[PDB]
Design a protein around this ligand. Structure first.
Ligand SMILES: Nc1ncnc2c1ncn2[C@@H]1O[C@@H](CO)[C@H](O)[C@H]1O
Ligand SMILES: [Cl-]
Length: 164
């Protein structure tokens, strides 16, 4: 496969699934691994090793289901695990009206270079964490630009399965 295609499909899959869940107030927590590995947190969840799709991301987070209680971790071109533990931030700067999903997303962002996306159970707002910072209630346009900048690392070049 071709990474550029993989990376844009990942972005689209996050955008479509979080849009779907935001409209319905479905809580979600999706962490995308980058240069810092998250293998230890993958091991805490239920292994999926699945192809990335918006449909599977949505089905995972349906409330009161086996896979919904925790984080999804995406590693390379797979949904690696669901219902994974992430470390909680102890920061007193995180607003008290945000839930544990936000605290978990902040916590993993403080110890990895991962990009984590949260859909709020209470408001449907979409938030993102990176490097110990929270980007709260981002618009669809803002989410798109952030994901483009952080998850697409290849410019326009010749497609090839050997790219890596
Ligand atoms: N340690 C954790 N790691 C990942 N998600 C967590 C953790 N603790 C709570 N959550 C999230 O909080 C619950 C609701 O806020 C979600 O079901 C779950 O994803
Ligand atoms: Cl929430």
């Amino acid at each position: 496969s071709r990474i550029e295609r993989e990376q844009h499909h990942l972005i689209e899959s996050i955008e479509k699934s979080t849009q779907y869940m935001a409209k319905r107030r479905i809580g979600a927590l999706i962490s995308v691994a980058r240069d810092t590995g998250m293998d230890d947190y993958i091991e805490t969840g239920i292994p999926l090793n699945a192809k990335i799709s918006s449909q599977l991301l949505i089905n995972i987070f349906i409330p009161n289901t086996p896979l919904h209680d925790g984080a999804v971790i995406i590693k390379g071109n797979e949904i690696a695990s669901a219902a994974s533990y992430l470390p909680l931030s102890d920061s007193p700067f995180l607003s008290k009206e945000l839930g544990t999903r936000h605290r978990a997303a902040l916590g993993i962002s403080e110890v990895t270079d991962s990009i984590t996306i949260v859909v709020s159970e209470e408001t449907g707002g979409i938030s993102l964490t990176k490097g110990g910072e929270l980007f709260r209630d981002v618009s669809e346009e803002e989410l798109h630009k952030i994901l483009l900048k952080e998850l697409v690392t290849v410019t326009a070049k010749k497609p090839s399965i050997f790219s890596k």
